[PDB]
Amino acid sequence: PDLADLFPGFGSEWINTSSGRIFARVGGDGPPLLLLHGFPQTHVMWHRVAPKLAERFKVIVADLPGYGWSDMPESDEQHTPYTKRAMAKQLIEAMEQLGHVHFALAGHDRGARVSYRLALDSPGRLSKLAVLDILPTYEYWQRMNRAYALKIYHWSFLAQPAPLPENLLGGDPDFYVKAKLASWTRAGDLSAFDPRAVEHYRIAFADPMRRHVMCEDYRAGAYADFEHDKIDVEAGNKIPVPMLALWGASGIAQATPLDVWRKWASDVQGAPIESGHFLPEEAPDQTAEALVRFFS
Amino acid sequence: LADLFPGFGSEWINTSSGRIFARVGGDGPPLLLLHGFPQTHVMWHRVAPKLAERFKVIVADLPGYGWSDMPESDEQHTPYTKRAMAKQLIEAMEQLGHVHFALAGHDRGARVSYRLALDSPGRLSKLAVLDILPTYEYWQRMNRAYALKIYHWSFLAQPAPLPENLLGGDPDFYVKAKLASWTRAGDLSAFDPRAVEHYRIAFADPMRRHVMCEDYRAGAYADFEHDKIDVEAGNKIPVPMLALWGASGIAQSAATPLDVWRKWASDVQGAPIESGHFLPEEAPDQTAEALVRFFS
Numbered sequence A: 001p002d003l004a005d006l007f008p009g010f011g012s013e014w015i016n017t018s019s020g021r022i023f024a025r026v027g028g029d030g031p032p033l034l035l036l037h038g039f040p041q042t043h044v045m046w047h048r049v050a051p052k053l054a055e056r057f058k059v060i061v062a063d064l065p066g067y068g069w070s071d072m073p074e075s076d077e078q079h080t081p082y083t084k085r086a087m088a089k090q091l092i093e094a095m096e097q098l099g100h101v102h103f104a105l106a107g108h109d110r111g112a113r114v115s116y117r118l119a120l121d122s123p124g125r126l127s128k129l130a131v132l133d134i135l136p137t138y139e140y141w142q143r144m145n146r147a148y149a150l151k152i153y154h155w156s157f158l159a160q161p162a163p164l165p166e167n168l169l170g171g172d173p174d175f176y177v178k179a180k181l182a183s184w185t186r187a188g189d190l191s192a193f194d195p196r197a198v199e200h201y202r203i204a205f206a207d208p209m210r211r212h213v214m215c216e217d218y219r220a221g222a223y224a225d226f227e228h229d230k231i232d233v234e235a236g237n238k239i240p241v242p243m244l245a246l247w248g249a250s251g252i253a254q255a256t257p258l259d260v261w262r263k264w265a266s267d268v269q270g271a272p273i274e275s276g277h278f279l280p281e282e283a284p285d286q287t288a289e290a291l292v293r294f295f296s
Numbered sequence B: 001l002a003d004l005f006p007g008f009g010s011e012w013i014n015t016s017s018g019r020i021f022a023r024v025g026g027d028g029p030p031l032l033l034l035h036g037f038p039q040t041h042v043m044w045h046r047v048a049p050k051l052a053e054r055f056k057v058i059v060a061d062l063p064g065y066g067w068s069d070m071p072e073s074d075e076q077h078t079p080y081t082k083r084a085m086a087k088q089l090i091e092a093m094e095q096l097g098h099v100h101f102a103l104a105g106h107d108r109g110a111r112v113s114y115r116l117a118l119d120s121p122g123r124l125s126k127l128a129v130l131d132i133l134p135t136y137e138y139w140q141r142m143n144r145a146y147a148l149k150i151y152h153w154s155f156l157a158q159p160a161p162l163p164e165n166l167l168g169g170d171p172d173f174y175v176k177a178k179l180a181s182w183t184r185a186g187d188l189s190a191f192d193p194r195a196v197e198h199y200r201i202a203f204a205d206p207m208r209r210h211v212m213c214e215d216y217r218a219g220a221y222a223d224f225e226h227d228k229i230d231v232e233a234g235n236k237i238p239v240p241m242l243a244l245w246g247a248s249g250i251a252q253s254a255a256t257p258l259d260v261w262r263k264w265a266s267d268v269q270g271a272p273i274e275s276g277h278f279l280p281e282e283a284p285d286q287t288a289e290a291l292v293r294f295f296s
Helices: A084-097 A110-121 A137-142 A146-151 A153-157 A162-170 A173-183 A195-205 A209-223 A224-235 A257-262 A284-295 B082-095 B108-119 B135-140 B146-147 B151-155 B162-169 B171-181 B194-201 B208-220 B220-234 B257-262 B284-295
Strands: A011-015 A022-027 A032-036 A058-062 A103-108 A128-134 A243-248 A268-273 B009-013 B020-026 B032-035 B054-062 B100-107 B126-129 B241-246 B267-272
Touching: A022 A162, A022 B020, A032 A084, A032 A110, A058 A084, A084 A110, A103 A110, A103 A284, A110 A128, A110 A137, A110 A209, A110 A224, A110 A268, A128 B146, A146 A153, A146 B135, A146 B151, A146 B241, A153 B146, A162 B171, A173 A195, A173 B082, A173 B162, A173 B257, A195 A209, A209 A224, A243 B151, A257 A268, A268 A284, A268 B162, A268 B284, B020 B082, B032 B082, B032 B108, B082 B108, B082 B151, B100 B108, B108 B126, B108 B220, B135 B220, B146 B151, B151 B208, B162 B208, B171 B194, B171 B220, B194 B208, B208 B267, B241 B257, B257 B267, B267 B284
Parallel strands: A032 A058, A032 A103, A103 A128, A128 A243, A243 A268, B032 B054, B032 B100, B100 B126, B126 B241, B241 B267
Antiparallel strands: A011 A022, A022 A058, B009 B020, B020 B054
């Protein structure tokens, strides 16, 4: 009706946590694998590659806390419930509700930031980890110069104190969500996306409280998340989980991503994928292929 | 609109690139006063009568701002480059018979002023800049802290129509937020309400707002390139210069202004004034005195 079912055969589950419920589409069977979405999308971003992974895994496609259909915990002045640290702990809680204490994880964009923070804080919870088209938060801010500030302007814009970004995004929320989706594709338009998927992103972005939380996300990314990343880099903490790093040839991560990730993880492999930023939709077959071989 | 320059004449000056509006008053040596973002010529209403004591004061709207004509921009935003702005105002000065004049600039017009002195030093007797550093110096010092501080440099520079769409939802809010955020008090209490209505009305026009985005686009590309050639070639400004910066201004953040300006000019004097970014309005008496003593 209002929104289409893009996960045929997948169940729909509401997982209870201390900080609120998390929505997830669960399907398949086998070892548990968690797939997290990013900005400005929802879990439906995984609809093209989830069926392939469901052949070998129990795939759980969850809304990040405050995103999609997940509950939105009340934020505070340090934006703690939307830090990557607190997000990871909520997701660990949700997984325990499912009986999964040791699972595999793949993240994209904001949820990818949740993924590597989770691996930094709780390595024992992960068998293997994959991040798609990101570099660590500390690494983004440290390389901030003229060229990169123009490219990822929204990192500083979205981090402005409330209610300035909330008011401006309300000027034309339809346009902004579509401008962000097309600008990061290799094609430079919406042709790569499925029309039913864009309608999910459109509806979610249309709610003023949803946009507030995504602002809280980027505010955490400019302050608290930077400090936590800053502690680890100074301490020499590296990720012990076997890791795969996939980036788009015209993505945002393009520093040399693999050389950068070697400083943050003991055991990491990497491959470029011919796409823009949205790998699972731009290059679904190639993304699914790299994930299954790594996770198997 | 209120008359904030009592007794001043009003002249419409014709140039190749369009007409320039200016309020003319006093008598004596000619002195040009330029405004900046997001204001108009009326920003000078507190100090213009004092300088009109001793100079022929010309208070002009920048090209595309206020009541001046708005030439059509192009792919490089050429008519809103500081280089092209400088030639237009030189053209307007010649209309009045002023081929050798004194100039003081604030914010964007200060950028026009130091560009004017680099390209055409012989046209200036003395030059004053208020609460700025060269454009190149802003971008070179861009880091995490500064990118959060002056986010609008990267936001306003995004390709059209992305900022124009966001500003159009509630332009009243944005113009007031920018004026209040840059004062030391952090509100609109420093400004005269009749002057604020001038800024609001000017910002209320969609074509005006496009021109200010074109200004920041030139400041993000062409004007930086112009600054880059001069800084690397060792070209310095030979005109005697005065640099006034606010203790809570933008220039004082992330640099010490006087040492920076010594790198760009042979003969510079500088003084800090206890104010925010809007010197002629926040601290009118202290600013006017410093201007009169320097220009005399």
